[PDB]
Amino acid sequence: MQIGRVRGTVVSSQKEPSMVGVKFLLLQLIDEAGQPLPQYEVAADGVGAGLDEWVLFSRGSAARQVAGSEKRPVDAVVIGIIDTVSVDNRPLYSK
Amino acid sequence: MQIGRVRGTVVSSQKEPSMVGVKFLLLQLIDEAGQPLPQYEVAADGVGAGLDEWVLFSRGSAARQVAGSEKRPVDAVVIGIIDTVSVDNRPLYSK
Amino acid sequence: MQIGRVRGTVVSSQKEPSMVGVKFLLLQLIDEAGQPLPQYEVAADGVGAGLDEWVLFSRGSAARQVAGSEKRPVDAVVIGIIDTVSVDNRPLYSKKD
Amino acid sequence: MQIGRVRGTVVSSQKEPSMVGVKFLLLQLIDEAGQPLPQYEVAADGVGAGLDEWVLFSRGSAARQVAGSEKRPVDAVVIGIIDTVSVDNRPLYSKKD
Amino acid sequence: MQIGRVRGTVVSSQKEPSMVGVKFLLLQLIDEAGQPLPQYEVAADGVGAGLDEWVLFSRGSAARQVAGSEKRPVDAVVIGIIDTVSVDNRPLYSK
């Protein structure tokens, strides 16, 4: 999994029918030190993360494991909103 | 998923027979700021995307989840044509 | 698999229900020369790895193979704490040291 | 999928028995401008591609989807020999040239 | 698949029980002339590769296709020891 910051949304009307009703969040990757990286991922979000929240996300077939997604062509998923990250027994991030 | 721009087409006549009927789009990767990247992906397209359109695409076994591709050796798929990308409540891209 | 060093933990209370009970470790990538890299991975850990320990971790659907995780949306898993790494029949890493 | 150029073959006699019969091609990655990259992949070839031909290839479990490969430990597969690549409706690559 | 040079072994005693009995080889990624690349992989080896030998290895769920590993959390596997790499119909590596 990687840590991402919610930066926005992607909307698509003409799409594979299996993807109807799925919310797409634009996530900015965060590095080991809590700072933005230029990389991004667009991920399905069934949890409900808002702008600027940190999330844990997974890539690959992991994205199909959430209820309803077993046969969706989805390769990235938000699995949780992050409350805390600690590094070397000190807080890096606290929501 | 990542964002790509449709830049062209790949044609193959001598190929695995399980790949017959798949249209191959050449996608140019788009970065966090809506800027073209030197990276590309060739993806199966069952949505019907044309030149210069922005698309959301998935990689890996996600590509086999679309009806008719369950046992094709495909590892990238166009899942939707993008209408809008919003960042921090402002438009980055609008079709 | 890759080698990672345990640098910390990630906690999430609002998450996919399948993920309840899973401990998340922040891993720093270690290279083939035993040096840390500016890359990280957050992995599920059911083996009890502690801070500063080196671990072997797997990515992708490998993460779902451990009993309990078959239908979890996890893509990285700690599979063991490393005791030794040898290169060219010589010690590179020894936990006991 | 990515585009690769066929550079040669890899031969292995001592190998997992499930891999018997599989031809291994060394592929050099091609970039967005049709130029060779330092990166490579070794792919199973059931299509029959020759030296310097451009191919499309897939990675991951995609490689297991062709007849005979369902339970093979293969993670890269040649899926087609490329005849043409177009960009902006104009040729970038034509096999005939 | 890619080409690795066997450089060492990794030993782990505190581990997932499914993984007991698996030999872990430290592989240095190399190109076809044997030049080191800045990547490595720790791979399951059921073939029996020794130090400095060249091997073909696979990543991902491919590693679970070997008998005995169907339900192991393994994501890299040695599939064979390399005898020759021919380029432009000329031998570049010979064992």
From Swiss-Prot, chains A, B, E:
Its main location: other. Transmembrane segments: none annotated. Keywords: Bacterial microcompartment, Carbon dioxide fixation, Carboxysome, Photosynthesis. Residues 1-83 form the BMV domain. One of its GO terms (biological process) is photosynthesis. Homopentamer. Interacts with full-length CcmM. Probably forms vertices in the carboxysome, a polyhedral inclusion where RuBisCO (ribulose bisphosphate carboxylase, rbcL-rbcS) is sequestered. Has been modeled to induce curvature upon insertion into an otherwise flat hexagonal molecular layer of CcmK subunits. This is Carboxysome shell vertex protein CcmL. The gene is ccmL.
